[PDB]
Design a protein around this ligand. Structure first.
Ligand code: HEM
Ligand SMILES: O=N[O-]
Length: 153
């Protein structure tokens, strides 16, 4: 359970993302793919991309980055009351895309990394704490759905 002040921190951070959703989404996906190349293999859409330059030049990668972070922003603005929004993503990611929960942990770390990189000296220690809690909540609630469907624990 995040506090109100922690939710406020999270959504203040998210306001930085919303000023350039495509830019953040692209930087997150590239950080993920390059830090954890197994992740790229899950995207039949993107696995042709070999180099960071090709990733950066991919307009379609940007487009998908918008789709993904738009969904995450909507979830965060629910301040934990996200059952309806989280259900479809759980089902797709477990059963269709076949994304292990561990990869969602890597995704969370890529988000944090990119926030520091884009906003140096402006992503406060309080805000990092709050964002961690928000993301941990999202992974806990997705993981329960995966467990239900026979995918994790
Ligand atoms: C915070 C984490 C994430 C969010 C909010 C998110 C959100 C979304 C959304 C909204 C879609 C399109 C709708 C859908 O198919 O359900 C999608 C598709 C997809 N996601 Fe994610 N996702 C996340 C994490 C991941 C991770 C970590 C991976 C892989 C390592 C992944 C792989 C995919 C794939 C393969 C698709 C299908 C893309 C296509 O071929 O068009 N997602 N995601
Ligand atoms: O992308 N995690 O440092």
């Amino acid at each position: 359970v995040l506090s109100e002040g922690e939710w406020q921190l999270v959504l203040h951070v998210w306001a930085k993302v919303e000023a350039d959703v495509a830019g953040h989404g692209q930087d997150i996906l590239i950080r993920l793919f390059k830090s954890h190349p197994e992740t790229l293999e899950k995207f039949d859409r993107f696995k042709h991309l070999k180099t960071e330059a090709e990733m950066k030049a991919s307009e379609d990668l940007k487009k998908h980055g918008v789709t993904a972070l738009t969904a995450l922003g909507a979830i965060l603005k629910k301040k934990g009351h996200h059952e309806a929004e989280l259900k479809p993503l759980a089902q797709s990611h477990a059963t269709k895309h076949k994304i292990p929960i561990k990869y969602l942990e890597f995704y969370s770390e890529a988000i944090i990394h990119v926030l520091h990189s884009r906003h140096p000296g402006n992503f406060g220690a309080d805000a990092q704490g709050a964002m961690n809690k928000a993301l941990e909540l999202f992974r806990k609630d997705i993981a329960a759905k995966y467990k239900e469907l026979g995918y994790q624990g």
